[PDB]
Amino acid sequence: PNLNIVLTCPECKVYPPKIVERFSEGDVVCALCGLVLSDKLVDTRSEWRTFNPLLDGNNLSTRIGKGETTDMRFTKELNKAQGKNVMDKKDNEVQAAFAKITMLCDAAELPKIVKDCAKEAYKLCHDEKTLKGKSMESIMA
């Protein structure tokens, strides 16, 4: 099946077609022919200009604290009731080791690059019988 679409001018057909993008018009044109192909393009840079999941894995990270439009006692209730699913995933250990290496790397005043590389190194193996414990110090170091 593969569901895939390749653009092709239905009146030139001479190649995988030499077309261009008119980004200020949101249109694609067969540059050899001049007929528009498809219209109303979707943005590709303002979405980035508007503002790590791969290191944290498939499971989605959540920094949950306290807000402003609620009482302090209800924020304390939120902090007490938000800790009901810290044992189902192995991601609890993943961000536990991540917090530990965050402490260690930023204690060693290392760059963010080094921090992310250590995150990757732990994430790559992260669970094996070749790991076999080793007090977490061996594998983190």
Partner 1 sequence: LRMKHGTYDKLDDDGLIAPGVRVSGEDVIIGKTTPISPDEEELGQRTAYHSKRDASTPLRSTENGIVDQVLVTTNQDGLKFVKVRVRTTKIPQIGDKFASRHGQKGTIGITYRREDMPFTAEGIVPDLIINPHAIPSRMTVAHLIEC
Partner 2 sequence: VGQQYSSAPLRTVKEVQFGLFSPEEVRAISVAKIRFPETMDETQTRAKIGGLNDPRLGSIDRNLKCQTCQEGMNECPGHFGHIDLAKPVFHVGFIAKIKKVCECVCMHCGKLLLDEHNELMRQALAIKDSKKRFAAIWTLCKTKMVCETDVPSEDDPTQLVSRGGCGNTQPTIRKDGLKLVGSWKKDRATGDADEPELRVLSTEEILNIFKHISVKDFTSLGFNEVFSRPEWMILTCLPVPPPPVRPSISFNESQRGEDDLTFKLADILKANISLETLEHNGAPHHAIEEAESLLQFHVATYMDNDIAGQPQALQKSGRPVKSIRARLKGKEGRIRGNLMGKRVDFSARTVISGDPNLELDQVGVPKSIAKTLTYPEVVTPYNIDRLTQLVRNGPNEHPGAKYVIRDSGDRIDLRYSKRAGDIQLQYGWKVERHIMDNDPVLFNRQPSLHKMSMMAHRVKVIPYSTFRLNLSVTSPYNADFDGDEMNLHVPQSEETRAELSQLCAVPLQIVSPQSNKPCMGIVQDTLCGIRKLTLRDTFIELDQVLNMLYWVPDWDGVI
Question: Which pair of structure tokens corresponds to residue 32?
Answer: 């050899």
Is 28 a binder of Zn ion (CB under 5 A)? no
Residues sharing a CB contact under 8 Å with residue 94, sequence separation 6 or more, in sequence order: 56, 57, 59, 123, 126
The one-letter code for the residue type at 11 is E
Q: Residue 98: how many CB atoms within 10 A of its CB?
A: 21
Is 30 a binder of Zn ion (CB under 5 A)? yes
Give CA separation, 76 vs 62, 81, 82, 134, in Å: 17, 9, 10, 37
33 is in an annotated binding site: yes
Is 20 a binder of partner 1 (CB under 8 A)? yes
Among 39, 93, 106, 120, binds partner 2 (CB under 8 A): 39
Q: For the chain, give the number of residues.
A: 141
12's contact among partner 2, Zn ion, partner 1, none, with CB below 5 to 8 A by partner kind, is Zn ion
- The kind and range of the H/E element at 122 are helix 112-125
Among 80, 112, 129, 132, binds partner 1 (CB under 8 A): 112
CA dist 36 and 80 (Å) reads 59
Is 23 a binder of partner 1 (CB under 8 A)? yes
4's contact among partner 1, Zn ion, partner 2, none, with CB below 5 to 8 A by partner kind, is partner 2
Is 135 a binder of partner 2 (CB under 8 A)? no
Residues of this chain that interact with partner 1 (CB under 8 A) are 20-21, 23-24, 111-113
Residues of this chain that interact with partner 2 (CB under 8 A) are 3-5, 22, 27, 29, 31-36, 38-40, 42-45, 47-48, 51, 53-54, 58-67, 69-71, 74-75, 77-78, 81, 84-85, 88
